[PDB]
């Protein structure tokens with residue numbers, strides 16, 4: 139109701155989309171009001187961690203129209219998750235369609251242009267059915283629910299700090315690059331410890347020889363060279379391939395005129411970048427004040443303000459989302 | 474209701490234990506018959522793999538008594554589990570009791586003696602109640618149900634084969650040591666793969682550098698050196714601490730006389746053992762004819778019969794299970 143004090147917490151919205159896959163196929167799908175999910179006490183979703191999901195948003199423009207930011211990329215990636223866990227995939231039709239039904243029905247829950255709100259969509263897939271063994275499963279449920287949400291862990295483009303961990307949230311040859319609940323389960327601990335010290339989160343390093351940056355179990359990482367000319371994100375099979383990263387990495391080259399590089403970043407060489415931040419749907423480029431790596435707090439630009447490049451990447455990206463700045467063809471679906 | 478034909482399949486028993494946890498405390502915990510858990514769409518257990526479980530069996534003796542095997546260990550382990558994922562822990566009291574209750578109530582589903590059957594118990598804790606952002610759930614569920622079962626991927630001691638993997642089921646410093654859903658979500662794919670080519674399951678090697686052996690799908694690994702005089706089992710901060718392995722590791726030394734050693738084992742130096750196999754609960758010392766690693770296929774004893782020492786360890790353990798031998802201290806509880 140009040141978009142002022144709106145945060146990234148849960149809120150029950152009128153209706154949500156639901157569909158079952160049994161005997162080789164998905165039902166037509168329908169909007170329900172249940173809010174609760176019902177599954178066997180032996181469901182693979184509960185014991186063996188066979189679950190996957192997405193996070194996309196819907197924004198309200200100053201024209202009246204509703205924007206969807208690259209839904210096609212979300213549908214795409216889930217197919218990737220679904221695979222990794224022997225789960226049936228969903229077409230870009232059943233997906234975008236779901237999201238559209240779940241926004242149209244809950245349209246009154248969409249924050250109006252002005253306040254930085256947005257309608258978050260959490261599409262998820264879990265294996266159900268009676269079972270006990272370590273196999274896939276006889277059935278599945280695909281659901282899409284939304285909640286009005288403002289900033290995740292930021293505010294007004296204001297920066298925030300991060301600290302490294304000893305723990306690994308994803309393995310070298312694991313599901314680290316898939317949005318499957320497993321990865322996150324392993325982040326809770328190191329992430330909570332990271333919060334008890336008034337930090338934003340935790341930046342995990344390569345599983346093996348923790349020497350280079352991965353991401354933040356909540357968003358990707360990206361810095362900028364001192365001569366503020368190059369945009370950089372680490373490349374690693376273990377990090378989730380963010381729609382936002384790949385997007386930022388796009389404007390970075392064609393709209394802001396910057397050199398771009400996907401490659402390694404040593405925690406041993408932070409002073410190579412002038413300003414750094416994390417990115418994501420709920421993350422939405424978040425200035426990174428400093429990084430603690432033991433006896434070492436490293437501050438790029440300001441700890442109270444964002445760098446100029448971080449702001450340009452923000453104002454451009456966010457414009458596209460709310461329809462303030464012409465968006466590349468193909469991105470953003472009207473509603 | 475024929476036990477001669479019974480395997481690791483879900484059968485709906487009569488009653489389940491169902492305790493909650495709200496506002497810092499666990500409910501009393503009654504029994505019911507719904508085998509349909511009821512979560513909240515935002516459940517932490519559905520999206521972030523906030524979940525762990527246990528595995529223990531209840532067996533019926535010759536004389537008439539019912540044996541519950543080392544339930545105290547399962548209780549402790551499931552504590553370590555919950556701890557790693559920020560979930561409230563159940564004490565031996567609440568735990569061990571929860572089992573018993575289920576054991577009794579469903580006593581007719583306990584296989585008779587002489588069938589080599591058993592009543593499988595599945596205790597598990599999951600995060601429930603509304604949520605969204607990545608953080609521990611607000612409320613928690615703990616439940617226990619049971620099901621009768623013959624053996625696992627075997628029957629008798631006839632062996633089976635295993636294949637190495639390039640994938641990894643857990644990161645060096647991930648959650649391999651805890652029995653949590655993510656673990657299995659990832660041991661799902663390489664499984665399907667292996668079983669597709671007629672291997673019992675894949676045997677994971679080593680997150681960072683696949684030189685040593687971790688464990689298999691749902692079982693630890695153990696071997697006997699060539700002189701059949703020493704017992705060697707892998708030791709790493711990322712493999713689940715099997716109770717079984719720990720138990721054989723106790724017998725091998727006393728009841729059997731052998732020398733023990735927890736250390737490393739290189740797939741290279743593989744013919745450095747007379748026999749080997751995989752222990753565990755549903756598993757139950759599963760011999761190993763040979764191991765497919767790369768091109769060459771290595772075979773310790775044979776693909777047809779268990780190594781003598783493996784046989785002994787089998788009988789010694791199982792005898793203790795059904796009481797035809799003599800269980801050590803605290804090892805067994807009489808329901």
Ligand SMILES: CC(C)CC(=O)C(=O)O
Nearest residue numbers: 193356418419420421607
């Ligand atoms: C959109 C993300 C930044 C939010 C999140 O916690 C996720 O996607 O897992």
Ligand SMILES: CC(C)CC(=O)C(=O)O
Nearest residue numbers: 272528691753754755756
């Ligand atoms: C106790 C285990 C050996 C049973 C099982 O199948 C598992 O844990 O996945």
